[PDB]
Design a protein around this nucleic acid. Structure first.
Ligand SMILES: [Mn+2]
Ligand SMILES: [Mn+2]
Ligand SMILES: [Mn+2]
Ligand SMILES: [Mn+2]
Ligand SMILES: [Mn+2]
Ligand SMILES: [Mn+2]
Ligand SMILES: [Mn+2]
Ligand code: NA
Length: 325
DNA sequence: CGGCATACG
DNA sequence: CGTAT
DNA sequence: GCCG
């Protein structure tokens, strides 16, 4: 079992769902308390279990697995023996965890804002609605649309959105292309939002594209909210006899950077963090969604494909469906 | 012990 | 500060 | 919280 998640296939569905979900509760709770290191360890331990070929049934099966020490092993031990982990259940039931989860799941509210509101005594969405003068426009939109945005987006919804985005992109710049990324590209059947990557085969023609796309979407009446190369929108998605608000992310990259942007925006989040960590710490190369930089030669790697990037890093290629770390 | 990914709006 | 994978 |  390799130590980095980018060194191992991780499928979307696996054989240790309950164990990984418990560890991810502790990771989330660590994040609400600002402990990014503990969050990462719990996330990595969770992902190791997702990568195993069969269920963990006995504690000895953890011996030698990376990222399982005293704490994560005890969590698993309790789940194996009693079906529940007291720490995990204590977190689940806590007022702090529930409220931080509720607040941070609002579009426009991060851990720092949620925590401040929590310390001020606020607990519910109606508590936030009562004093809208304290809210940003982004948070007002997140709060107004919160119910719709908590409803899973279905792959059937995605095809519809892709069609309307392509229509606007085709008018903004003939020849430009739209690629579905994010969790749906990794094979998820449901998601919290839809992620699209836009480019054009002639380097430089994509310059200025996103404002032109946004203006055309807004003119078709499809944009309930938007704030460049990244656009975090709320779309109006037609529904049977009505519609619902859906979060959509639109990203533009020049074709030279497209493989890096595709790789980054396809995720998972943990997979990309681990991949960038591996790149820097094991290979001495600096990776982001624009490129891969050798700081010794002071040069950027040219990539024509995700396969190129994996090869550059000395990693076996992983299709998106196996990047579900 | 230090590090923990790395961007853009 | 928020957002993204 | 865990690794190197
Ligand atoms: Mn502990
Ligand atoms: Mn016991
Ligand atoms: Mn997404
Ligand atoms: Mn997104
Ligand atoms: Mn850029
Ligand atoms: Mn330390
Ligand atoms: Mn996400
Ligand atoms: Na949020």
């Amino acid at each position: 079992m390799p130590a980095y998640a980018c060194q191992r296939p991780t499928p979307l569905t696996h054989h240790n769902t309950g164990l990984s979900e418990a560890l991810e509760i502790l990771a989330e709770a660590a994040g609400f308390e600002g402990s990014e290191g503990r969050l990462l360890t719990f996330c990595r331990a969770a992902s190791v279990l997702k990568a195993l070929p069969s269920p963990v049934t006995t504690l000895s099966q953890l011996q030698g697995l990376p990222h399982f020490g005293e704490h994560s092993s005890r969590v698993v031990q309790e789940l194996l023996e009693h079906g529940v982990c007291e720490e995990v259940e204590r977190v689940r039931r806590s007022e702090r965890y529930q409220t931080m989860k509720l607040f941070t799941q609002i579009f426009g509210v991060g851990v720092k804002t949620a925590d401040r509101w929590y310390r001020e005594g606020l607990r519910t969405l109606d508590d936030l609605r009562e004093q809208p003068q304290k809210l940003t426009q982004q948070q007002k939109a997140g709060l107004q649309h919160h119910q719709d945005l908590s409803t899973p987006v279905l792959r059937s919804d995605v095809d519809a959105l892709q069609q309307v985005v392509e229509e606007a992109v085709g008018q903004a710049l003939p020849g430009a292309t739209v690629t579905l990324t994010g969790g749906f590209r990794r094979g998820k059947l449901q998601g919290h939002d839809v992620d699209f990557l836009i480019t054009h085969p002639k380097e430089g023609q994509e310059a200025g594209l996103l404002p032109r796309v946004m203006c055309r979407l807004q003119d078709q009446g499809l944009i309930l909210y938007h704030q460049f190369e990244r656009s975090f929108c709320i779309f109006r998605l037609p529904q049977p006899g009505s519609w619902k608000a859906v979060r959509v992310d639109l990203v533009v990259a020049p074709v030279s950077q497209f493989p890096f942007a595709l790789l980054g925006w396809t995720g998972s989040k943990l997979f990309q963090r681990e991949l960038r960590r591996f790149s820097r710490k094991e290979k001495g190369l600096w990776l982001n969604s624009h490129g891969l930089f050798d700081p010794e030669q002071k040069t950027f790697f040219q990539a024509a494909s995700e396969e190129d990037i994996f090869r550059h890093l000395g990693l076996e290629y992983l299709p998106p469906e196996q990047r579900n770390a």
